[PDB]
Each structure stands twice: as structure tokens, then as C-alpha cells.
Amino acid sequence: GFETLVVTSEDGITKIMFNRPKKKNAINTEMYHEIMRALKAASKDDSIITVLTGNGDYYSSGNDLTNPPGGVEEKAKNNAVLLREFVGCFIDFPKPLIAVVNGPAVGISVTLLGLFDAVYASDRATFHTPFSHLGQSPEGCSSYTFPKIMSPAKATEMLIFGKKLTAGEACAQGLVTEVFPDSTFQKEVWTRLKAFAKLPPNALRISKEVIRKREREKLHAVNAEECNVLQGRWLSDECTNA
């Protein structure tokens, strides 16, 4: 039983659906733990392919802005330990992992796209990482992945300067596999994924592994560096005023 996700599995696809549509799928502490539990189950289940998507209008508005005796410094520590573990589940996820981006995506839900195998977007999806505007720094391994996927010249605009991308721009810049018109989005994506799930399953998993294994150690080191820096930013005056 999940309180913040709807998780199903059938015919070789596991579907993990963010389910706080009244909060535009903001990721609160509970959803952090539950996404990790869903991923850990999906890593051992019978599915060939695992899909993340959002209920409703938004894919996700990112971290929930609403969440101790040992202080703001110890809440910072425990939040960093948790972020690091959460990102770690995406670095390690051993099967094909697909984002179906049904609408606007923000923050950590965008930065994680650099660790997904494929990303399909509705043309009403947008991609925004306004870290800078909130006195914070990158996470989700995006400090490593975004310059490499997008080019430094483009990644700067998104990561440092908080420019919001359209679906088309995110696709042209390598974050998004393909964009579909919103009225046909759901059909186009599921039809494709159902075909993909009929491919030889050990071949799909083994092909992902030969692509991803040699990079994991570096991604885990990137993730640890990001979380350490981010712990600092949370305790900063710019983060508080913003």
C-alpha cells in the first residue's frame, strides 16, 4: 500500500504513478521513501520495463516545500542522507527505466531524467530547474549529466541560470527522447512501450547493464559530492531568504 504513488505491474511493464495531483505531484518525504520502495520492488519483479509518470496536469512540481531538537543543521544532514540514497536508487536501477512526462516537470524530477533510459514528453511538458533562484545547487547527478547530454553552453542556461525549457527544446537538447502531441501522447507512448516489452527480456536488461555498469561508480561519486554541497547551501542565508 502506497500513500503517494499508484504502482501497478502487468505484461512486463511496471507503472509507478505520482499520485498527489492536488499538490501537482510534489515530492514530500513520504514519496521519497515510497519511490525507493517501489524501485527496489521493481528491480526484482517480473517486469521488463519500469515507467514513472504523474497523475493529472503535472508530471511533478519537484520537492514539496513543506517539511527538530538537533536543529536546522541536523535536518540538513538527514535530508542529504536521504537525497543521496534516493538518487542512488536511480543510478543502480538495473532494468530499462522510462519517464512518461505528461506535463510540467520541476526540480529533482527534471534532474533525475539524466539517469533514465528514455524520456517521452507531451508537448505541454516543460522542464525547469530553478535551483539558483532558491539559493541552491544541482542534484540528481545533473552537474555531471546535463553538460554531457546538453552541451555546457546549454546546460548552463538550465542549471545555473534557471531557464525553463519547452518540450521541443528539451528534446533538441538531448533530455527527451521524443515529444508527442498532447491529445495523442498517452496512446503513442503506451503503444510503443508495449511493443518494447515484447523484446527478448534478458537482452534488454543485459544491454542496459553493459551501457550503465562502467559509469555507476562515477555517478555515485557525483551524487555524494552534490549532496555534500547541497547540505551546505541549505544552511546558507541565500537559501533562507529565497
Place this chain on the structure above:
Amino acid sequence: ENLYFQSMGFETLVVTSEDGITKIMFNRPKKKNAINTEMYHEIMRALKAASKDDSIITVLTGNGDYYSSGNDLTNFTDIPPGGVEEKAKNNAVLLREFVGCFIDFPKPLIAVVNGPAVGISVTLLGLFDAVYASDRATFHTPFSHLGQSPEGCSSYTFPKIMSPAKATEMLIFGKKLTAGEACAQGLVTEVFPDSTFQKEVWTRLKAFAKLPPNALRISKEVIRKREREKLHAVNAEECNVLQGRWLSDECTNAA
């Protein structure tokens, strides 16, 4: 020795050297330039010849309507004394060595992609210096459909060149690209209309071959040398994986 004069005779290739350019042409056009055991070996020989001749630039291209359908699946081989296992090992050693020749090739190496390209002939494109395509070339790596895994260093190069989100569709899910898509995604340098393709590309290559010859070579070396060690390790790892996949049920059934 691999010395020759103007043309080097092969059974599955046409190998010629004029205007400072050694041209290696797949020549099993009836079989869509499918690469059999004989062609793996002749290609490695042709590359050794090309690295040592007086060409400035080297081209790989196909005869007829296809660049290459990739590995020849009609090329059925007897099982040797150590069984299908020994056969999978033998084949893995040969692939590793074949890819290694592309990793190490020291002159500018250009692909002239005249028509459809499949498999190993596509994955190798990530080790090339330039790739020119006809607008009727297509690019297809249907490894998963055959119960196999990536080779040619593509498990490393394609994500980096195309982005992970585009490389996945091609490598894991077997999507076939048009020439325009392959160029948009970084694998192809430039696409030309089929009707003037050969004219335009060869005009350009003949110009390039008149550039200061040693500078061409030294610049490629400064770009490529520091990566070769990693590429070699990637190739070895892909070949070890594939050795296991060739013995799998999924691979058998797929044939």
C-alpha cells in the same frame, strides 16, 4: 607485408588508392554487403594496408545499394572440438580484434554511407572521424531483437554522441534511424541528396586530402590517443558479454 600498387586484390572487398585516398569498398553486393568471416579478416588486412600506404585519408564504403547489412547470419559454421562454447569464444576473440583495428587506425577514417547500414557496420561509426550519408541511407542496430548486446564500443560511444535518451531507442529497442535522424543525433557528419551524393562527397574528400598531410594525422592523434585505452577496455567488456549472449536461449531462438 601488405604492400600493393594502386589496387589490392581481395575476395570480398575492392581496395583502391588514388588522389591521396585509400578507398575500402565492401563488395558482396548480392548479399547486401553482409560481413562474413572472410570479410572480417580481409577488412582487418585492408586497414593494415591503409595504415601503411601513402594515402592521407581512408574511406570505408559499400558497393551497390547497401553500405552493409552487418554480420552475415547465413554464414553458418561448424562446431569445433570444444563445442558451441569454444565457438562463442573464438568469435568473441575475432570481434574484439576486428573492433580493435578501428580503435587503433591512425589516419583520418571516413565512412561514405551509400545506402542502408545495419549492426556492427553502424556501431563502428562511433570510432570514425567523419561519416557522410546519402539521404537514402538508414541506420539500424537490432541487437535486442536477436537476443544480443551492443558491440563496436557503441555501449560507450553512442550515449555520449547521441545522448542516453536517443541512444537507448537505437541500441536497446532497435529503432531504425533515417539519415536525417542519424545526422541530428551526431552519428553522421552530413547528409546529401542521393542523386548527387557521390559527386559532392568525393569533391570534398579530394579537397581534404590536399591538406598538410602530417598535420591531419597529428591532430587526429591528439584527439584520439588519450581515449584508446578506455575504448579497448570497452570493446573487451562488450565481447565478454556477447560471448555469453550468443550461448543464450534468446539468441538461439532469434536466429
Place this chain on the structure above:
Amino acid sequence: MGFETLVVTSEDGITKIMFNRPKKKNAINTEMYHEIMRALKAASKDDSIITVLTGNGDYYSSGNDLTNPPGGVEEKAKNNAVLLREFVGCFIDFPKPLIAVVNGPAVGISVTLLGLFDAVYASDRATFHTPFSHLGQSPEGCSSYTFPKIMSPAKATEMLIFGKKLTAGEACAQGLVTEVFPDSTFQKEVWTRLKAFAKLPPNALRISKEVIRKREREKLHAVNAEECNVLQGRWLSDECTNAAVNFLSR
């Protein structure tokens, strides 16, 4: 402090370093190498949030000045390779967001350094040319590493090895340039954006850049060193000796 070949200003949280030999298409002479390094050193310590590099007049920069003793040509190529190395090293290490405002044609080292910038904005009149091979030379500015990664090997080759000159639109499509603007609106569009950028939280800007760049710097410094070594030799080859005399003639 005080500049012969640059104009350096600072306002609205932006330090602007402008190449200032417009009668030589902002060619970079030995003096400008040393000045750019002193300017970047100062900009790194001043209270600006963003630093910009641009060129005065019609060119960004035509790149190295070909006009450029005690141990003859042997020890000279050595000095020049030591200076090139130090010059490129300042870009690798520069700690604040570094932006290129490419006002017209760029050539040579002015192009290759763009792989070390944070953002790059171009006028549609700008072009990008690295004719190193034509000149009998090899790559620098870390371009041997950075350009295949940014542009794809297949496109980097055409630039670096074969001397293709890119339009602003092509450079942008291939990852080198952030955004291209019509020449008539370029200055206004860029500076408006940059002025808004300079108002974002400055420690977040600086620290974001740091988490992006820091872990790559070692590698970049190695690539720089290797490139300067090769180039030290190329400068003493018949193809370069010979090419430089032909360009003397232009």
C-alpha cells in the same frame, strides 16, 4: 593595472573584458595574452557575479597574431608553448560564470577556448573557424577533448581537422553556442539577459559552477599540457614554417 590591448569595465554585477585591437580584427598578440590573464585574475577577485569576454568593432577575434631570439627558434617555441599553457589554464580555472559575447567572426584560439566557457551568445553575423590543419598546426584550448564531446566526433572532425568554417546557426546547433541573435538586436538582447542573470543569488551561481566544473579541471589541465607539447613540435615543422610564410603573404 592599465591595458594596452583590452578595455575592462565593471558594472551591474558584470565585469566586461573587451578585445581592443580592432584594426587588426582583434588579433591576439603576445601582449594581449598576458593582458587577458591579468584581466581574468582581477575579474576572479572583483565583486562582479559574471564575467564577459567580447571583441571591439567588427570581429570577436581573428585569433593569434602571426607577427609574433636568445636560444633561436628552439627556445622560442618553448616559451610560446609555456605561455599558451598558462593562458589556457586561466580559462580552465576561472571560478565565476564566464560568458562569451561573440560579436562577429572568431578564429583559432578564440574559438577553441569557447569549450571552456559557461555560456556563449552569438550575433548571426558571427562565424567560427579553426583552420589549424591549413596552417600546419594541431589543436589547443583543450578543443581536442572538448569539441568531440560537445559537438560529436563526426562534427568536431570537420572543424578541427578539416577546417570547416561554421555559421552562428551551425555552431549553435552543434553545441558550441548557447543562442544566436539577429545582429541588430544582439547587444540589447544579450545584455538584458546577462543583467538579469547577475541578479540571481551569487553564491548559488558560483557554487553551482563549482560543482559542475571542479571535478573536470584535472583532466582539462592534462589535455592542455599534452596539446601544448604537440604544438611545440608542430611550430618547428616544414608544414607550419611553410604555411606561416604563405599567410605572411596575405
